[PDB]
Design a binder for this molecule. Sequence first.
Ligand SMILES: [Zn+2]
Ligand SMILES: [Zn+2]
Ligand SMILES: [Zn+2]
Lengths: 55, 47, 505, 475, 374, 251
Amino acid sequence: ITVNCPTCGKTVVWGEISPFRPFCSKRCQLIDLGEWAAEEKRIPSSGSDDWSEEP
Amino acid sequence: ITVNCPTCGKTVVWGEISPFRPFCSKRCQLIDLGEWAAEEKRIPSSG
Amino acid sequence: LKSSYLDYAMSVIVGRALPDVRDGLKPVHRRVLYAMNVLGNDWNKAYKKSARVVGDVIGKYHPHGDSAVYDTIVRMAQPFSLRYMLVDGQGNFGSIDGDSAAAMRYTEIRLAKIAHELMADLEKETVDFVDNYDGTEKIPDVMPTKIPNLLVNGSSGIAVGMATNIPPHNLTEVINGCLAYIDDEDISIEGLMEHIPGPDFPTAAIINGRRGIEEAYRTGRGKVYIRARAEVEVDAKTGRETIIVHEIPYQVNKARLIEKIAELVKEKRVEGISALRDESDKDGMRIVIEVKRDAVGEVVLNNLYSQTQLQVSFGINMVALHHGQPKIMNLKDIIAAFVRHRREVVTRRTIFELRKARDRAHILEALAVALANIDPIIELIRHAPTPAEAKTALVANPWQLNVAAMLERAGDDAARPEWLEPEFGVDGLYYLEQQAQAILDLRLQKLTGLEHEKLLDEYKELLDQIAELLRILGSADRLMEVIREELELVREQFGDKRRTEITAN
Amino acid sequence: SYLDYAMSVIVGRALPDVRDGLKPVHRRVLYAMNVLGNDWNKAYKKSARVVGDVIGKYHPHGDSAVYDTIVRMAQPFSLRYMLVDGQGNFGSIDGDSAAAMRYTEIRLAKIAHELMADLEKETVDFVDNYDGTEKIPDVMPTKIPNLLVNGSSGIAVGMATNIPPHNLTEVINGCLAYIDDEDISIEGLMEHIPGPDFPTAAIINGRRGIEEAYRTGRGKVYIRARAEVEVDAKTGRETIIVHEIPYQVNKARLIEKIAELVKEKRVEGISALRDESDKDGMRIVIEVKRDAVGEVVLNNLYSQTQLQVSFGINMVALHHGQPKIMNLKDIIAAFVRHRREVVTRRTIFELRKARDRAHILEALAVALANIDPIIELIRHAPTPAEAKTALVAAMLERAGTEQQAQAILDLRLQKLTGLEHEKLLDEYKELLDQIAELLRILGSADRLMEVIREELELVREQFGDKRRTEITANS
Amino acid sequence: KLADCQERDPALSELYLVEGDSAGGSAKQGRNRKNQAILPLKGKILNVYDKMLSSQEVATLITALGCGIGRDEYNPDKLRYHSIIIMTDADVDGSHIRTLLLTFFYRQMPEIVERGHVYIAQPPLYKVKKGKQEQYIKDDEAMDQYQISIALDGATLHTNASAPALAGEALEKLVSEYNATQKMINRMERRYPKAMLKELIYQPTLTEADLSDEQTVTRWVNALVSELNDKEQHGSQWKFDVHTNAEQNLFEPIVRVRTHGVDTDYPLDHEFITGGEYRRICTLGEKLRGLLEEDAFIERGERRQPVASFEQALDWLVKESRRGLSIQRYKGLGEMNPEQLWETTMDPESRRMLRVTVKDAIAADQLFTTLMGD
Amino acid sequence: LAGLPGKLADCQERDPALSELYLVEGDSAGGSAKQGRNRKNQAILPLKGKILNVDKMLSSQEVATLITALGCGIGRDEYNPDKLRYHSIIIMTDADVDGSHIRTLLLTFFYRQMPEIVERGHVYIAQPPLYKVKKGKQEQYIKDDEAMDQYQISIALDAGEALEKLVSEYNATQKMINRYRRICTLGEKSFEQALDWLVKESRLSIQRYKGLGEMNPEQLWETTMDPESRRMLRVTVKDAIAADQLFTTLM
Ligand SMILES: [Zn+2]
Ligand SMILES: [Zn+2]
Ligand SMILES: [Zn+2]
């Protein structure tokens, strides 16, 4: 049961063999946390109401 | 025929007495200019 | 010197940012409400989605992509913003904390009962209309309201050169004050105040001191302090005090208040707070503040009055548009202008009702004499292939007259249209096109025997009606009596307990 | 599971429907205009009116989407055949914004009315809106293949689309050629449809791409500007002026990119770059240094500047509710069979309506005969309900309900004139001629397709125009 | 959002300043290349809401204007366009864009306004369209003149029975006097009721010699208020009275009306009778009630209708003119197409344009301050 | 941070096992939840999705508040079951495109930075009623199309129990049509005439919910917050991985 590291892509496997699931190393884990903190984590807008006059 | 200086507020008489009208000195004029540059001449309306 | 353009701008801006004193509404209020009226979004009829009203409004009366419209629609629905709501909303319409209302496609809405009393006799040529942005629609310049509204729901807005800040009042009390005005024009402010002690707040809370209220109602301007209904409850077993707050001044944000308190204890500007919690739920507002072993409850409380909006100063500035210009006006002036409006409203109303009943009288008479004269008209129209020829034949010849007796029996000179020229109508010779069309477009389902009787009885009814209408226009005192019974009906319909306490000094 | 469903919803909201090639937005806008009576023969209506009701009834989110969609359907440079006639400032190819929704006036185009003909005749299915108080047409009963004619573009990630717009007359001729014979060859269709025709005039560089695109459903084909290069006759110098540019390209951003490339030395040999575009005509002026060659500058621009652009054509559209890739023949066929169902449905409606109307007309004419006998009978009973309870010949025989009695009772005295007899008689006979013709149409499919051909001839005649784009092939 | 030009001679060319969302695409696609240069600017800049005028925009504008900043560095020979058409919507939105442009001028380039280089654009207020006829009239003045023009186009007054029908220049003169006088009466609505002054033109004159008597004045005011009473539509009762003057024994009428409940008095003093306003009122007065008789006809073009008075006549005329056509008041420039914008507000042959005085710019500045002060 | 006043509507109950947290969509069910809940056992955190530059995202102010409110650590190594402030956490959001984004990301933050909180079963999704039917003196809320169908036929009747068996068999056969001896028994054994007469005799006001912001505070409370007559699903690690699949699909 292996799932890719969402930071670097290093395929690391589930279980106690990895203490930073689903990350491989903690630094990447921390980097992802920083991204969440930094609002680096987005989902692009689809082509849910926007007002033209409003901001 | 006197106009008030839009920067400092000092009254300056219209006419060639002062070369900076409607401003009293060039420093007031330049200040106003920079303000126009610094986007500080804005008009806020709400509702 | 204020020039011509300048004053233009000042005029439109104010005219958008202050209300007329008659209905106590700004343009956007009126537009939203009237649009809801045209759309027939009534109070006992099923809800509509906040979207449709908004779309209609943008299309007809407010052509901007502005949340302005949906924001107005929303505010009218929130119990904590309007004393007496003008919009019955279902769904999630926000919260006092500052939570937003759901998207305008989820939340549904329909006018409130009081809203219908705000637009009662609107179709009865009661008040001027005016063109919309494309001229293809009309919109009411004022509302034929039966509720004070201005005094009742209050008004708040900021403009170019002046602003208005009127608090809301209890309807019951305001109506009472109106009645007292009518019965006693020349009355005195001290007198009106016998019926309205002061402002009423949806939130509730308390008001501290009557002096400001009094100065306001006398002048139009006065500052009055709204204190929150907080309470200190002492737990018997441990002796550990715990404040608790149940209501808070009008227009104060719960979240910003709580955050301000937390900030105040973090900066250590106020001390003696062990915990700060928001326990408000379906049971109502509560704010729990837990006093430390070290501290005294009441002391912490007074600090939370001193450094927070748990006590706040409401500045009353009663400005409103008198005619097309803005004017500061005391309480009596306001009630007086409401009432003038009622005099104009009900008068225009009765003239419209008059014209209606007169036209109905004319046509019903035509139908009568048609029912009496059935066979020869069937024949004459029988023969003529063209409807216009049949019409001309109908008009060309007067006809004769159980139908005639009551025409004569229940006639004054007038059931006649005020537009009728002298020649037409009744020597026992009917001088008669309009009516000719009225019978040319007569259905066959009517030729039964008792439909006449129905039309006669209806004619007698209309005669009693025009009698009462003429009676109502004839005596000004009668007009006033009608208005009094109308207001009495209003305060019998919606009358609410006082919600805000008033304590002197 | 859930992701797949979201997958599907996105496809359903970002792809056209082959019968009319319209996304939900387009359809809702047009239909709102229709019910609003925003006709081409009647005066303009402010955009705010339309939008407004779009928001209230069909699409309530933001003006942003709904007025933009309207603006697109009005610009000559955006749509081949326009669906909205718009008076006022509706933006520029340089990317200038259309005026406020408050200011601009709009009304359906004649073409747009032809897109919605025979709608009220229960032709196409309706479906519910959010609130559920109103019904919206799932598909339009169009007499135009506006999918091919106006093209499309796919928002969606994953399946996406990029169908180009075509010339009306050519697609109509192709459709008639498909009517004549099924199983018609693709290359036989390319005889009628040489390729895509853009609203902006331009040159198409490779027809191999066009061919592969029409056949596969996918392909890549290059759009090339109509730049023209020219010397000043006695001066012995050159100047390049572009006259037209590829579909979906900002002139302002184009010239801006040219300025960039000049500034970065990436393009050399340009002495002066100017935009002399105006009401008389578009023209972009690119004055040549003496040291350089006009044509080589003109090809260097073709390369890195967007004077020439690679248009990747793909034809994914919704068929039976599912996103499928399609041939030219597949789309044309879907259009045709759609029209078959259309004509069938509407003719059935016309038939039933005429039958009911003739039934009523019959009862009415009976009442015109049985007048005096009836009038007394109905006069006796004091109640219209009780009297209702109490409730020529040659031609009905020759040319061959309680609600009928109600339709008789609900009749005006104006109807009992001598002329109305002849009127309703002529109407009756004409209705018999009509039901005869309608039955004759339902019976033979050949005549049905022949009338379809007649309508398409009408379309190619009335709204058909010249071809704007040029197609050159030199390999 | 950058300029464009064509001719280099500053006197021969001109520079428009136009809002980007209302008249950017309009001006660009409708301009004349040769002499006209326009600048697209956006009058609402994002901040975080919407508000102001851009710094970059300001720099671009100064460069486009071309001649220097402050009174010192002004240089008439370096101004690039000697006519600078602030063509902006002129509701309050637009007015603000325009104002910033005028204020900035006033403070930093007062010369360009003083030398009268800054002219402003004026589009047509109205557009009229009957069937075939489509036309543009610039203000409310031309709108009124047009209104009466089509009101009288091919129509005539039959005063007594069938007598020498009135029309042409004579009818136009009479109607002109009438409308002008009713403008005077419109103005007076603050002092006296309008209906009372219209019946003041129909009823006979009342000289001061008549004021020297009592029964004649009482008769006069009685006839007036009675006529007003019977002709009343809105349910308002009219009564009368004559106050007595001790000195010289003069008498003056008083009109009492119960309008809703509001019994109100309206005295007619001597100075009113002698003033001149009442003199014009009485000139038109004579001229018109001296005139229509009965059994009289007003007819326009094909159709005719009998008519009790002038009023009914003119009302039937405007009704007859308005039957076919409708009208639009132009509020924004975005309402117009490039061709229309060109034909209307930009064509150097058809355009109405306003030159600003230093006092105009000063006014704009007082407006700016007042608004910025909030 | 330390202080969650002003952004969190905590409950009375301090003992985490007995209390629950509600992560609601702010511009959806926020204010409603803050007015329907029970102050004894239910805390409430509203959330939004911000838009800058060119979309939806979970903001810094919020994550810090979220993390603070949860109280446990970040990263599998740091997780502390005793620091945890609530055993039950509800992600109360709509099902639309943004309602999916707020929720899924919620799990995704959870899947990556607090995976244990998902594996311990502490987090619970909230399920609201899909149907509200009101004949029009009375009304009821219906959970699933299954219960909706059973309700619909049970009332469609108003013949015996054998008729219930027959219509259930017919419905099974129609399900088979949508998707042998069964179909043969039906074919040997019109019908839809009487059935459709029943359909017309039954069909009221039918309402399908599309959002949480259609419901009144009291309604939301009764329908999906009140401990009695509620409904919620315990998300698995598979659900979180699926959420991360959606996220990585949309980046
Ligand atoms: Zn890694
Ligand atoms: Zn100074
Ligand atoms: Zn404005």
